Amino acid sequence: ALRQARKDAELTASADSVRAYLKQIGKVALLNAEEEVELAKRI
DNA sequence: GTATTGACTTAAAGTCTAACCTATAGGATACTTACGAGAGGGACACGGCG
């Protein structure tokens, strides 16, 4: 229902392409300090 | 007047040095989604017949 409409809106054209880039970047969330330390040690 | 040579001075330039541009890098608290009509053609929905 509501989640179905969410998934339907997840697949739209978005001809602006800045809105498309924003919906693309919306996929990945933030991180906090300890995982930053872990990533730095790994790299 | 028209043919010369021998000095005699003069304005215009290759090269070394200095400053003034130019390409380039760097700069740690933590901050995470802007602001009219007029006609033709193609695509999506809905209903009809075998």
Curated annotation (Swiss-Prot):
It comes from the Bacteria. It is found in: Cytoplasm. Interacts transiently with the RNA polymerase catalytic core. Belongs to the sigma-70 factor family. RpoD/SigA subfamily. Sigma factors are initiation factors that promote the attachment of RNA polymerase to specific initiation sites and are then released. This sigma factor is the primary sigma factor during exponential growth. This is RNA polymerase sigma factor SigA. It comes from Mycobacterium bovis (strain ATCC BAA-935 / AF2122/97). The lineage of its organism: Bacteria, Bacillati, Actinomycetota, Actinomycetes, Mycobacteriales. The gene is sigA.
